[PDB]
Ligand SMILES: [Mg+2]
Ligand SMILES: [Zn+2]
């Protein structure tokens with residue numbers, strides 16, 4: 001299994017939206033960063049709750 | 056090159072995505088890094104244009120040497136992370152050390168890259184034939200032998 | 208429109224030498240000798256005196272209050 | 273003039289020098305380069321517009337002397353050279 | 367009698383890569399001393415138009431009660447009669463003529479400067495139209511020192527915007543003491559084949575040194591070999607190249623750099639008129 | 647309120663009020679165009 | 695050792711030879727002279743009436759470009775923080791004629807325009823021009839109006855012309871015509887390039903092999919010109935004082951860091 005770049009983009013978008021809305025961050029982040037790089041770091045660490053469903 | 060733009064009055068537009076989904080899409084799907092290789096012919100489309108080629112030739116030209124001051128200054132200007140100069144190649148008449156351009160350029164390449172090809176300056180095919188003969192014969196000739204057979 | 212005070216390139220003051228140069232050249236002297244006498248060796252300064260136009264007289268006649 | 277340190281490892285010092293430009297930076301690095309105990313030293317200006325007056329330095333020694341000692345010695349040598357030139361000029365003009 | 371442009375001391379040389387792809391590098395001190403400086407005018411027209419039934423608009427400072435009345439700040443430069451004082455500093459969206467029209471209470475119809483413009487009021491005239499209605503015109507002048515993005519072009523179809531304004535002490539100088547006012551990229555010559563530009567550079571150098579202008583009248587002009595010979599006789603290299611020293615390092619450049627005087631004209635495609643951004 | 651104006655052609659001094667004047671005219675030469683003179687107040691200009 | 699030799703000295707420019715110092719030091723001295731030495735210059739103008747054909751900004755710029763005398767003893771010109779002393783210059787003229795720089799009246803007698811013959815603007819019949827101009831110290835790096843003068847240098851080189859070249863007498867006569875010092879040995883003639891010496895076309899083929907240039911290490915020929923704002927010998931002294939003060943300030947800051 002390998003994430004296509006479209007799947008990765010959608011996962012990052014959804015995670016960033018959830019973080020902005022008020023969801024807790026699963027990892028510690030440096031202060032003064034926007035939700036987007038927070039989600040990017042979350043993905044880079046490999047800690048992602050969202051999963052994709054393929055036909 | 057990809058934009059096909061020249062600085063003679065050309066104008067450009069920028070749009071700022073607002074929502075988080077759009078920002079993530081732009082960051083992951085549309086960044087300049089991912090579009091180095093052109094979808095059209097499968098080769099690069101981002102690279103040097105005018106000075107990045109001529110200056111590179113000047114730097115790597117046969118018989119071009121640089122003093123210590125120039126070496127340190129150009130390395131710092133390029134942003135290359137270095138903290139000790141390599142061993143000098145050839146000494147100036149009055150005793151100052153010198154560095155050939157080839158080593159300075161080699162300071163940028165990765166540690167295990169290996170490739171060989173013929174460029175556009177090949178005008179004496181016999182020398183290229185000799186070098187290809189040696190390389191094909193061994194696949195890793197001692198760098199001393201290559202130096203005598205060097206050809207730009 | 209009036210003569211520049213300083214040379215654009217090197218900043219030497221040449222504003223006061225224009226009328227002298229014009230009057231001397233009109234008298235028939237060699238322009239090169241006149242410029243050398245005035246003390247302008249770099250051609251950056253000589254260009255300012257040689258290529259100047261005095262349009263202030265032409266545009267002075269229309270007043271706006 | 274105010275030194276802002278970026279990174280301070282062993283035998284290495286990388287810092288900004290706010291309030292200066294090429295005039296003093298080039299003189300300082302060229303004075304440093306003749307010290308036999310300095311392995312590598314250079315300066316650069318990262319951007320000609322935004323960082324026009326904020327040069328960036330990098331000084332590396334061989335461990336015999338700390339980089340601060342090298343910088344102080346270079347500045348002292350600059351001072352001595354300038355004073356000597358001033359005295360010679362004052363003598364020669366009269 | 368009505369020239370347009372100035373003579374620049376131009377050196378063909380690559381510099382910091384800030385003049386690649388038709389961009390040019392201009393000297394800061396030359397700009398400060400008056401090179402390429404210009405002024406921009408604009409005229410606004412306001413008419414006291416009479417309507418049917420005798421109702422007419424009127425030139426006066428609008429009361430805060432009228433419809434569409436902008437903030438009091440924008441009327442600070444208005445005289446009582448609704449006409450702005452000449453030589454008064456003005457900025458964007460400031461009104462010039464205070465006019466109120468009958469409703470279709472009274473509504474504001476004042477004339478104000480464009481949102482993305484600024485300057486100083488230069489001339490205000492009052493007069494009557496062809497049917498007896500009052501008419502005023504206001505002229506606003508703006509000082510426009512060259513800045514990044516302004517377009518420059520020579521006479522040989524070589525255009526470009528300035529990419530960097532470099533301080534004088536960083537400009538390379540010549541053994542004869544010449545500091546170029548403009549640096550162009552050598553890569554622009556071979557692909558365009560404008561030899562006339564190089565010949566004009568040599569001719570400008572010769573004319574400046576010799577003290578008289580050089581004729582360039584097409585086919586019967588002065589041959590270039592004569593110009594090269596004259597330049598050689600005057601104490602310069604016959605190729606137009608000179609030894610220059612680097613501004614930053616202070617050392618001597620390895621190559622001999624072509625340098626001369628070239629006529630340059632500043633076009634009106636200036637960045638202060640192109641830039642605009644939309645928020646909502 | 648009464649204001650000060652200058653003639654376009656003869657450059658003389660002409661005084662009149664627009665809100666009342668039904669016919670703009672320079673009484674000295676008949677010109678139909680008038681200037682608004684510079685106010686006599688100091689203004690600061692930066693020499694840069 | 696460091697030593698300075700004077701070549702020539704006019705009333706507004708001086709040419710000397712600096713020896714025994716590195717290229718970086720010479721470049722630093724040139725840059726400090728060009729854009730660190732302070733002078734007086736017009737900064738802000740307060741017009742009262744301007745009926746001339748020129749706009750207010752043009753007249754203000756022309757006033758700014760006018761050189762001004764700068765006292766040496768009263769002010770600490772070598773300091774790194776110039777004081778805010780202000781000099782007011784006024785002018786009131788009208789009628790036909792040309793307004794010259796000599797008509798400016800300065801409240802401070804020590805500061806006044808150097809050259810009283812610079813034209814400012816031409817006034818027709820009846821036009822009036824009244825203003826007050828304010829002057830203050832500044833540096834050349836902030837605006838070119840504060841530059842004290844012009845300065846450049848070049849390498850001190852000696853050109854060797856072998857006697858084996860036919861028609862070398864022509865080259866010697868050309869060098870003498872240019873004004874460069876020239877001396878003859880038994881096998882070659884030596885030319886000192888006080889000014890640039892460019893070889894003619896027909897002698898180019900002998901370059902490198904028979905005509906070669908020798909560069910004397912650590913020797914530069916300077917050339918400093920002034921517009922009268924400061925004495926031509928005080929500029930170098932002020933620049934050297936500025937360099938010393940900058941070095942001392944850097945020492946103090948570095949000591950503070952440690
Ligand atoms: Mg284009
Ligand atoms: Zn000049």
Ligand SMILES: [Zn+2]
Nearest residue numbers: 653656672675
């Ligand atoms: Zn009249």
